[PDB]
Amino acid sequence: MSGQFTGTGTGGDVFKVDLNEQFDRADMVWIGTASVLVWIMIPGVGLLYSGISRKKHALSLMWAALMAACVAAFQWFWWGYSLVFAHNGSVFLGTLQNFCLKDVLGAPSIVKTVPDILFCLYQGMFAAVTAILMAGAGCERARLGPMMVFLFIWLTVVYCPIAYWTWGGNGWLVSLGALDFAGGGPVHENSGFAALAYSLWLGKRHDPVAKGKVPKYKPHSVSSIVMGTIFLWFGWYGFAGGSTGNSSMRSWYACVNTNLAAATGGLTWMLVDWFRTGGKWSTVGLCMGAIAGLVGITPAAGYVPVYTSVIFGIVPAIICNFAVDLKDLLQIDDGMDVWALHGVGGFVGNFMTGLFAADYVAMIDGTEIDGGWMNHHWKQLGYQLAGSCAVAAWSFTVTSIILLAMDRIPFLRIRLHEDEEMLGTDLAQIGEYAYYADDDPETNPYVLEPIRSTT
Amino acid sequence: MSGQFTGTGTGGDVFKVDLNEQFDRADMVWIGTASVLVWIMIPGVGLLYSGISRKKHALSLMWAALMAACVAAFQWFWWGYSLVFAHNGSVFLGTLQNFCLKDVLGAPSIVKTVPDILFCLYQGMFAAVTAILMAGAGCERARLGPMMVFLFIWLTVVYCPIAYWTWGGNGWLVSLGALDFAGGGPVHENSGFAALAYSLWLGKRHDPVAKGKVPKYKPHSVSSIVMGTIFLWFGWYGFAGGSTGNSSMRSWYACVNTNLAAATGGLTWMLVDWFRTGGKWSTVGLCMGAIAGLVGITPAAGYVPVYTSVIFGIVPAIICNFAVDLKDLLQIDDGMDVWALHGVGGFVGNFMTGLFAADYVAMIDGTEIDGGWMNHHWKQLGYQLAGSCAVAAWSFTVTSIILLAMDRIPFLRIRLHEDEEMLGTDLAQIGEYAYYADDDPETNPYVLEPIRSTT
Amino acid sequence: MSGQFTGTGTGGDVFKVDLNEQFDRADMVWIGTASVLVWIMIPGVGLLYSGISRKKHALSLMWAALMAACVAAFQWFWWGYSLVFAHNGSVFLGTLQNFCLKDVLGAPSIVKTVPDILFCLYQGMFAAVTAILMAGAGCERARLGPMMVFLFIWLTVVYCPIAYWTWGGNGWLVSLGALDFAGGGPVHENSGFAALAYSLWLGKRHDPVAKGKVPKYKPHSVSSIVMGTIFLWFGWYGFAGGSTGNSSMRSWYACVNTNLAAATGGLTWMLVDWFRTGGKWSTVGLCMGAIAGLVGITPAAGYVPVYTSVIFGIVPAIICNFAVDLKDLLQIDDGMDVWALHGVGGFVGNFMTGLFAADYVAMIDGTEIDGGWMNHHWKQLGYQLAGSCAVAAWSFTVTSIILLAMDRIPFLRIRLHEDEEMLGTDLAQIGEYAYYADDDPETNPYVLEPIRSTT
């Protein structure tokens, strides 16, 4: 009544109008397919960080990726989507108008080429990828119940505000003119500096794997590293290629850039390791460099000329390779790989987007930008820096607050203090905890949860 | 001659007309993509049931999934497609009009938005998923040759009639008005009660893993469980999202519902295990609950409001978690996990579809239904029950007949009697059977087939 | 200026025209999705050939697949795409007009339904699949630096000319009328006869695994075989289904043919092994037969009637199964599995395409061909043979030249002579090479590179 297209609410009355008439069907199919591709990045993250670990984590990140898929999907439905995309928000956050996805259907989303329900599906996968990056960064000696509560809180007050600034209709970074093609701020920079907060507050200090003359690479499972890198590179075609919101050839241009950045990242990191080790070929390094290039190109893929995409592989791979060495200077391992690849890599890619963004690349599908230094729009570089500094500041500070507030509450503390922690070898010889005898997550039906040596 | 569009046979003469003009190209692309996604559910099933097993099966279900992909694809081409979709069928079964896919091309299928050749591709994947569920349920001490003959027969006289009732142009459940969005009857309820027939006739009785005080969860391979659950959740976007037959936003609505049902299923099952074990976190339980929610939402995903999708996770996860305990009461393990998740989960989801189905959800793409209790269409619940009872009755009874008839034929008996079965340790010390020395399917080039201790 | 559609160069001025208006959006979405699917075939190849190996390769092919993805993507961007698709080529090779993908954007590609940038993405995946087939065939005792230089050279002077003959605007096989639906010449025949050149020049002679009474199947990892076969069959829907360049139902017809050829290949090979071993069921054989059928149907999938697709499974599976026995006659293992499946299988499929190709199958999307023996176009068979003989001759001869020229240059030699090769057990007891103590690529951070026993 008349139920015709409103652009608001559900978008119109399905008994009176065909809400699909507002959208190009092929735009919708590509973003639906891209959503399925982003979903498999979630176990990709878990396999990557399970395999790279120089310590045997009690919690298996391949399994924890499914936990994170569950918690993130519930959080997004409950209020995460609304806090980012309620079409009635301020410049810093949305509202609860779409609580429990009420009225999320056929109105054109902030990306006008797809309806709200499809943009909800797609952008929910980005929230889930960020959740498993965060669970991966903070997984060492984590308690599972507190970890799930932590992810729910962290998505609500760290991810959703930064996403709003980046993508929301009134978000202040959008208005400023900062460029972030595929969510490098909300996913990579954000999770990387949240990882850093974990590292400096809850990570183990003077860690035996980061202390003295110890190997930079000493992986738990190379096959897990490679399988994770496979799922991540495969899924990144949806992550970057879908960030146009349409079926135009800017989507395929973005995919070419993504593949070439991954390829030149992997080769660059391996070559850097070859110089730095005196002639060894680093299995871990090739995979880390592919990830550095994928992270590097994320803010840029739909904005930069194809030949510059090799720079988004080369330069993040070099800078991140040396960032990992900071684990030695701090003597801290926990959380630091996620910070090195996603935090440093995300900062570097965002910065370089202000150099190489081109108005004629964006205009492949009609997208209008001032451009970067390629267009002599010199001010663009400061817009990038303002966004990166704001994301890093908010993620680091608020994550720190959550971690330290939970640490003060005994049943929410995410990581026990060691003097509180009964060893699994001793739990096993108690009958109530005999299942700790099996310390191999491939056969144990139960998570080897940290237990307070107070019962 | 004139070769114009007939709606029958091949659909028209390709030298005179463009058969593609009848269809929206984006509808076709989504259903083609959805078909590829359903295909990877096939190894998903195999990995899931290989990993969950409390017994070391001689036949590897990850490998047997490829066997099932082969046998199902051949059966579907030979006559399975025709028995379901020959456009000239009765109310209980189709015909042999499309034997060896004769004349399967460009006529609009029973789903009018895609042509016959594409609907054949898509629906053939559902048959294959059901084949590996059945091979998984009956895999313990199976003989491979008899198993392949069994699957061919079972698809023909169990799957294809139930599929016809559910999807065929004249199928009686269609006419009755029963709702089954994505094939929960033909795939899940059907395979689950066929599994039950296996369990009660050919499964081992007084089984040491189900007898006395034994662990409910004792998995063969947690990594296989998790990888299977990954492929299943990823592929389920095609399974449910493609069941609209089109590129409309009802497809994406169905995907949101599927993801939220999986997410709330996984968390619910894990929480139930946490209460029931006194505080342990169940690795197996999280994955089983995701599957219970995916099964639960299958008949409902394109029919129910988004906020009700959490109920299709919560309630199947609870009921299935207690259904698994029935393995203790019966002291039978073999076949029972497939019955618990797909049979019980499929029944519960189908039942709840009669409660929560809504005419305004179906109408997102113009689909016309009376609705469920959400529309005060109280009679809908009895239509659901009639379908579930008919599927369970046919699958249980006819599977029982096939299994017991094959058991009476020495060269077709699917599972040897134990008193007929030479132990692999003794075969190994015979020179003709020395390859039984390697009882690990990761390195053995040969299936460790059960051998009659009569040669 | 006027910047309107030119059909050349970038295709027009993005500030004046919408280059996307030239293309059906759903055609573009399917080819973008198909590109992502071909990408996962790359690790598919690596897992397959890592798992089938009867020798423990020091270089892990699952990891080397990512290396090959990197080197192939760079080579394609640098000049590989231009050497195949520069719209200004001769009848044997392209040019450097699109060096570093200059001007590759919105002009219609040689496949007029997609733009250059998308055809570049798609066809680059075929180059990468061929790169990992070649790295797999030559992986035994390979040195990694020389291998990467070899792949770059081999793509440039073996792959790119054969691809040009097959797909280029003026390619001589195109003009002759040879049929090759999905690149069976450039990918399978080419890599298979390049593998053969490796086998006969650099492979080990009188090899203990191929000499005397030794098992035909003795795999390194059955799970790797199965996972590789999963990724290959899943990805082949993009490989074959995308080779129409469009969203028509010829794409879905091609997928039905691909699935049925894989299915009948797998069953046929397993049955042949069952007869030939006296009743054993071959795990490796089922997977090899699926690959033989996938290779067999590649030149044919969009050209032959559905019922003939079973012949593209049966006949390649039989001929390839006996081709593998040639490893016994030669007493050579290295490289020969890639030749047997891709070289022999590719030749057989190409040959049979001249028998079974049908003008009424091609015309499903308007494609015009004379047809094969199904249309009494008897000359078609000689066109197939001319292409297969030219591909095999060029690939074998030029690969031989590259391998033997690199062998003469000490720092480029791909495989050390054994008398040059220090054993890993002795390297380990040197302090500079102690990391050779860990000969298991699952935990070693470094490739176990062959070292000259001269330092």
Side-chain angles (χ1 to χ4, degrees):
Chain A
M1 12 278 167
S2 57
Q4 301 194 147
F5 305 135
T6 59
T8 62
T10 59
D13 181 347
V14 295
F15 299 111
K16 304 185 174 171
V17 295
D18 178 9
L19 301 178
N20 303 288
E21 280 175 11
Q22 304 171 91
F23 307 104
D24 181 278
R25 297 305 191 95
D27 287 357
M28 290 199 287
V29 170
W30 173 235
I31 305 305
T33 298
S35 300
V36 181
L37 291 169
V38 181
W39 189 87
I40 206 173
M41 299 177 57
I42 302 162
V45 176
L47 287 158
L48 170 60
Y49 287 108
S50 168
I52 198 173
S53 188
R54 299 192 296 183
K55 301 161 48 160
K56 158 181 217 252
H57 301 309
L59 176 69
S60 157
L61 288 169
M62 184 204 191
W63 180 87
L66 290 175
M67 175 273 299
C70 292
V71 171
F74 180 76
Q75 187 270 358
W76 193 247
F77 151 81
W78 184 259
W79 57 25
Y81 168 87
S82 192
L83 295 170
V84 185
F85 291 113
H87 293 219
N88 63 325
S90 76
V91 312
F92 297 108
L93 197 61
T95 70
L96 296 185
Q97 168 180 96
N98 300 115
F99 182 70
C100 285
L101 301 178
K102 174 189 188 64
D103 293 338
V104 175
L105 183 54
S109 79
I110 194 45
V111 167
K112 297 307 159 191
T113 43
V114 294
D116 284 340
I117 191 67
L118 180 49
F119 200 56
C120 179
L121 179 73
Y122 186 60
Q123 289 292 325
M125 311 301 187
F126 287 65
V129 169
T130 312
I132 184 52
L133 286 161
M134 178 78 247
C139 74
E140 172 68 0
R141 310 298 314 157
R143 300 199 296 163
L144 183 67
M147 173 59 79
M148 296 185 282
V149 171
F150 169 64
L151 295 172
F152 185 98
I153 294 170
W154 186 91
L155 285 171
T156 300
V157 304
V158 184
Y159 183 84
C160 288
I162 292 167
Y164 188 95
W165 310 341
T166 299
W167 288 307
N170 290 307
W172 71 268
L173 274 175
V174 179
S175 298
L176 183 66
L179 292 168
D180 182 356
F181 173 66
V187 178
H188 300 301
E189 302 183 283
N190 174 24
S191 69
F193 279 91
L196 184 61
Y198 182 89
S199 294
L200 299 182
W201 291 106
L202 305 196
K204 169 189 199 81
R205 305 281 185 97
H206 280 51
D207 192 312
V209 306
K211 174 211 84 220
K213 212 241 182 203
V214 284
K216 174 174 187 169
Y217 309 112
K218 184 186 77 40
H220 180 249
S221 169
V222 176
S223 64
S224 288
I225 301 182
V226 173
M227 188 71 75
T229 300
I230 286 163
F231 282 173
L232 281 169
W233 190 333
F234 171 81
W236 221 286
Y237 291 116
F239 195 89
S243 282
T244 56
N246 65 45
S247 62
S248 76
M249 69 182 77
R250 189 164 76 117
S251 304
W252 326 124
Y253 200 99
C255 289
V256 170
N257 276 350
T258 297
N259 183 46
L260 187 57
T264 55
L267 295 174
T268 293
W269 191 305
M270 204 172 57
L271 280 179
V272 166
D273 281 346
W274 183 90
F275 280 97
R276 294 188 72 193
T277 66
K280 306 193 196 60
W281 293 116
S282 177
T283 62
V284 179
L286 177 83
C287 298
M288 292 183 79
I291 309 300
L294 291 169
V295 167
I297 197 66
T298 289
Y303 291 132
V304 307
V306 177
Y307 65 89
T308 73
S309 71
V310 299
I311 302 159
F312 285 88
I314 294 168
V315 177
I318 293 164
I319 299 181
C320 295
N321 177 303
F322 282 88
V324 168
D325 297 328
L326 293 178
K327 300 162 81 195
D328 288 331
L329 173 65
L330 310 183
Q331 297 177 325
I332 297 163
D333 189 72
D334 302 334
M336 289 288 295
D337 289 332
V338 172
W339 167 75
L341 291 172
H342 302 266
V344 177
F347 185 94
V348 171
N350 197 61
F351 185 94
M352 292 192 310
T353 299
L355 305 170
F356 296 111
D359 53 11
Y360 46 90
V361 170
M363 204 56 202
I364 292 167
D365 65 3
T367 299
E368 292 182 10
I369 69 172
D370 286 329
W373 285 23
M374 297 293 299
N375 296 128
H376 309 308
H377 182 217
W378 317 111
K379 292 57 60 205
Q380 192 62 51
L381 192 60
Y383 300 163
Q384 304 303 116
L385 274 166
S388 289
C389 288
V391 174
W394 184 264
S395 173
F396 186 78
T397 306
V398 179
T399 302
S400 288
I401 295 180
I402 296 164
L403 293 175
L404 293 169
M406 287 182 82
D407 175 84
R408 293 187 324 237
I409 306 176
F411 70 108
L412 285 176
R413 161 182 310 163
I414 299 157
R415 185 173 172 162
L416 295 181
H417 322 67
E418 310 198 35
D419 70 7
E420 213 181 353
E421 216 175 68
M422 236 188 79
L423 301 124
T425 58
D426 294 329
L427 279 167
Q429 300 137 33
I430 301 160
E432 210 77 344
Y433 300 105
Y435 58 103
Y436 284 75
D438 184 358
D439 53 359
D440 175 20
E442 165 72 354
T443 49
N444 202 323
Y446 297 111
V447 177
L448 280 206
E449 177 89 346
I451 295 294
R452 268 183 181 109
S453 81
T454 56
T455 296
Chain B
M1 12 278 167
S2 57
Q4 301 194 147
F5 305 135
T6 59
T8 62
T10 59
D13 181 347
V14 295
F15 299 111
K16 304 185 174 171
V17 295
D18 178 9
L19 301 178
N20 303 288
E21 280 175 11
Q22 304 171 91
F23 307 104
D24 181 278
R25 297 305 191 95
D27 287 357
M28 290 199 287
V29 170
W30 173 235
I31 305 305
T33 298
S35 300
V36 181
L37 291 169
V38 181
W39 189 87
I40 206 173
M41 299 177 57
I42 302 162
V45 176
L47 287 158
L48 170 60
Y49 287 108
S50 168
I52 198 173
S53 188
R54 299 192 296 183
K55 301 161 48 160
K56 158 181 217 252
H57 301 309
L59 176 69
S60 157
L61 288 169
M62 184 204 191
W63 180 87
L66 290 175
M67 175 273 299
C70 292
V71 171
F74 180 76
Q75 187 270 358
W76 193 247
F77 151 81
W78 184 259
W79 57 25
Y81 168 87
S82 192
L83 295 170
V84 185
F85 291 113
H87 293 219
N88 63 325
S90 76
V91 312
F92 297 108
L93 197 61
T95 70
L96 296 185
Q97 168 180 96
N98 300 115
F99 182 70
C100 285
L101 301 178
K102 174 189 188 64
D103 293 338
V104 175
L105 183 54
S109 79
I110 194 45
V111 167
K112 297 307 159 191
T113 43
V114 294
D116 284 340
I117 191 67
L118 180 49
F119 200 56
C120 179
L121 179 73
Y122 186 60
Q123 289 292 325
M125 311 301 187
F126 287 65
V129 169
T130 312
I132 184 52
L133 286 161
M134 178 78 247
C139 74
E140 172 68 0
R141 310 298 314 157
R143 300 199 296 163
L144 183 67
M147 173 59 79
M148 296 185 282
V149 171
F150 169 64
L151 295 172
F152 185 98
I153 294 170
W154 186 91
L155 285 171
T156 300
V157 304
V158 184
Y159 183 84
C160 288
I162 292 167
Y164 188 95
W165 310 342
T166 299
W167 288 307
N170 290 307
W172 71 268
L173 274 175
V174 179
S175 298
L176 183 66
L179 292 168
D180 182 356
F181 173 66
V187 178
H188 300 301
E189 302 183 283
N190 174 24
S191 69
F193 279 91
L196 184 61
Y198 182 89
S199 294
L200 299 182
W201 291 106
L202 305 196
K204 169 189 199 81
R205 305 281 185 97
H206 280 51
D207 192 312
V209 306
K211 174 211 84 220
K213 212 241 182 203
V214 284
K216 174 174 187 169
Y217 309 112
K218 184 186 77 40
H220 180 249
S221 169
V222 176
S223 64
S224 288
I225 301 182
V226 173
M227 188 71 75
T229 300
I230 286 163
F231 282 173
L232 281 169
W233 190 333
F234 171 81
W236 221 286
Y237 291 116
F239 195 89
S243 282
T244 56
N246 65 45
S247 62
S248 76
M249 69 182 77
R250 189 164 76 117
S251 304
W252 326 124
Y253 200 99
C255 289
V256 170
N257 276 350
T258 297
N259 183 46
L260 187 57
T264 55
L267 295 174
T268 293
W269 191 305
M270 204 172 57
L271 280 179
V272 166
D273 281 346
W274 183 90
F275 280 97
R276 294 188 72 193
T277 66
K280 306 193 196 60
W281 293 116
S282 177
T283 62
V284 179
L286 177 83
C287 298
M288 292 183 79
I291 309 300
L294 291 169
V295 167
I297 197 66
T298 289
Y303 291 132
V304 307
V306 177
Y307 65 89
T308 73
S309 71
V310 299
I311 302 159
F312 285 88
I314 294 168
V315 177
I318 293 164
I319 299 181
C320 295
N321 177 303
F322 282 88
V324 168
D325 297 328
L326 293 178
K327 300 162 81 195
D328 288 331
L329 173 65
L330 310 183
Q331 297 177 325
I332 297 163
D333 189 72
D334 302 334
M336 289 288 295
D337 289 332
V338 172
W339 167 75
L341 291 172
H342 302 266
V344 177
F347 185 94
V348 171
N350 197 61
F351 185 94
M352 292 192 310
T353 299
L355 305 170
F356 296 111
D359 53 11
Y360 46 90
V361 170
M363 204 56 202
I364 292 167
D365 65 3
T367 299
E368 292 182 10
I369 69 172
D370 286 329
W373 285 23
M374 297 293 299
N375 296 128
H376 309 308
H377 182 217
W378 317 111
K379 292 57 60 205
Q380 192 62 51
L381 192 60
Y383 300 163
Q384 304 303 116
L385 274 166
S388 289
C389 288
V391 174
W394 184 264
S395 173
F396 186 78
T397 306
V398 179
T399 302
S400 288
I401 295 180
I402 296 164
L403 293 175
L404 293 169
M406 287 182 82
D407 175 84
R408 293 187 324 237
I409 306 176
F411 70 108
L412 285 176
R413 161 182 310 163
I414 299 157
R415 185 173 172 162
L416 295 181
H417 322 67
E418 310 198 35
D419 70 7
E420 213 181 353
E421 216 175 68
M422 236 188 79
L423 301 124
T425 58
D426 294 329
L427 279 167
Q429 300 137 33
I430 301 160
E432 210 77 344
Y433 300 105
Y435 58 103
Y436 284 75
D438 184 358
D439 53 359
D440 175 20
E442 165 72 354
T443 49
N444 202 323
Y446 297 111
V447 177
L448 280 206
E449 177 89 346
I451 295 294
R452 268 183 181 109
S453 81
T454 56
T455 296
Chain C
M1 12 278 167
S2 57
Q4 301 194 147
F5 305 135
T6 59
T8 62
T10 59
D13 181 347
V14 295
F15 299 111
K16 304 185 174 171
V17 295
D18 178 9
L19 301 178
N20 303 288
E21 280 175 11
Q22 304 171 91
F23 307 104
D24 181 278
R25 297 305 191 95
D27 287 357
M28 290 199 287
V29 170
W30 173 235
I31 305 305
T33 298
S35 300
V36 181
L37 291 169
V38 181
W39 189 87
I40 206 173
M41 299 177 57
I42 302 162
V45 176
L47 287 158
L48 170 60
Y49 287 108
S50 168
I52 198 173
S53 188
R54 299 192 296 183
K55 301 161 48 160
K56 158 181 217 252
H57 301 309
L59 176 69
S60 157
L61 288 169
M62 184 204 191
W63 180 87
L66 290 175
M67 175 273 299
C70 292
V71 171
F74 180 76
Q75 187 270 358
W76 193 247
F77 151 81
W78 184 259
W79 57 25
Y81 168 87
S82 192
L83 295 170
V84 185
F85 291 113
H87 293 219
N88 63 325
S90 76
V91 312
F92 297 108
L93 197 61
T95 70
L96 296 185
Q97 168 180 96
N98 300 116
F99 182 70
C100 285
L101 301 178
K102 174 189 188 64
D103 293 338
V104 175
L105 183 54
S109 79
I110 194 45
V111 167
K112 297 307 159 191
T113 43
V114 294
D116 284 340
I117 191 67
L118 180 49
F119 200 56
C120 179
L121 179 73
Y122 186 60
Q123 289 292 325
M125 311 301 187
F126 287 65
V129 169
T130 312
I132 184 52
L133 286 161
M134 178 78 247
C139 74
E140 172 68 0
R141 310 298 314 157
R143 300 199 296 163
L144 183 67
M147 173 59 79
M148 296 185 282
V149 171
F150 169 64
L151 295 172
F152 185 98
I153 294 170
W154 186 91
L155 285 171
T156 300
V157 304
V158 184
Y159 183 84
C160 288
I162 292 167
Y164 188 95
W165 310 342
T166 299
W167 288 307
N170 290 307
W172 71 268
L173 274 175
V174 179
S175 298
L176 183 66
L179 292 168
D180 182 356
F181 173 66
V187 178
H188 300 301
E189 302 183 283
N190 174 24
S191 69
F193 279 91
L196 184 61
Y198 182 89
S199 294
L200 299 182
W201 291 106
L202 305 196
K204 169 189 199 81
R205 305 281 185 97
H206 280 51
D207 192 312
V209 306
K211 174 211 84 220
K213 212 241 182 203
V214 284
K216 174 174 187 169
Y217 309 112
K218 184 186 77 40
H220 180 249
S221 169
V222 176
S223 64
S224 288
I225 301 182
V226 173
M227 188 71 75
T229 300
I230 286 163
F231 282 173
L232 281 169
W233 190 333
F234 171 81
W236 221 286
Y237 291 116
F239 195 89
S243 282
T244 56
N246 65 45
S247 62
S248 76
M249 69 182 77
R250 189 164 76 117
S251 304
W252 326 124
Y253 200 99
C255 289
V256 170
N257 276 350
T258 297
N259 183 46
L260 187 57
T264 55
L267 295 174
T268 293
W269 191 305
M270 204 172 57
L271 280 179
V272 166
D273 281 346
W274 183 90
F275 280 97
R276 294 188 72 193
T277 66
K280 306 193 196 60
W281 293 116
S282 177
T283 62
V284 179
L286 177 83
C287 298
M288 292 183 79
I291 309 300
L294 291 169
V295 167
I297 197 66
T298 289
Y303 291 132
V304 307
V306 177
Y307 65 89
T308 72
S309 71
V310 299
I311 302 159
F312 285 88
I314 294 168
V315 177
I318 293 164
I319 299 181
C320 295
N321 177 303
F322 282 88
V324 168
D325 297 328
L326 293 178
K327 300 162 81 195
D328 288 331
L329 173 65
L330 310 183
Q331 297 177 325
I332 297 163
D333 189 72
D334 302 334
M336 289 288 295
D337 289 332
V338 172
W339 167 75
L341 291 172
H342 302 266
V344 177
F347 185 94
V348 171
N350 197 61
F351 185 94
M352 292 192 310
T353 299
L355 305 170
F356 296 111
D359 53 11
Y360 46 90
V361 170
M363 204 56 202
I364 292 167
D365 65 3
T367 299
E368 292 182 10
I369 69 172
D370 286 329
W373 285 23
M374 297 293 299
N375 296 128
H376 309 308
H377 182 217
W378 317 111
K379 292 57 60 205
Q380 192 62 51
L381 192 60
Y383 300 163
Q384 304 303 116
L385 274 166
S388 289
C389 288
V391 174
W394 184 264
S395 173
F396 186 78
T397 306
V398 179
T399 302
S400 288
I401 295 180
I402 296 164
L403 293 175
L404 293 169
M406 287 182 82
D407 175 84
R408 293 187 324 237
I409 306 176
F411 70 108
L412 285 176
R413 161 182 310 163
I414 299 157
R415 185 173 172 162
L416 295 181
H417 322 67
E418 310 198 35
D419 70 7
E420 213 181 353
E421 216 175 68
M422 236 188 79
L423 301 124
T425 58
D426 294 329
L427 279 167
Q429 300 137 33
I430 301 160
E432 210 77 344
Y433 300 105
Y435 58 103
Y436 284 75
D438 184 358
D439 53 359
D440 175 20
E442 165 72 354
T443 49
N444 202 323
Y446 297 111
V447 177
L448 280 206
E449 177 89 346
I451 295 294
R452 268 183 181 109
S453 81
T454 56
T455 296

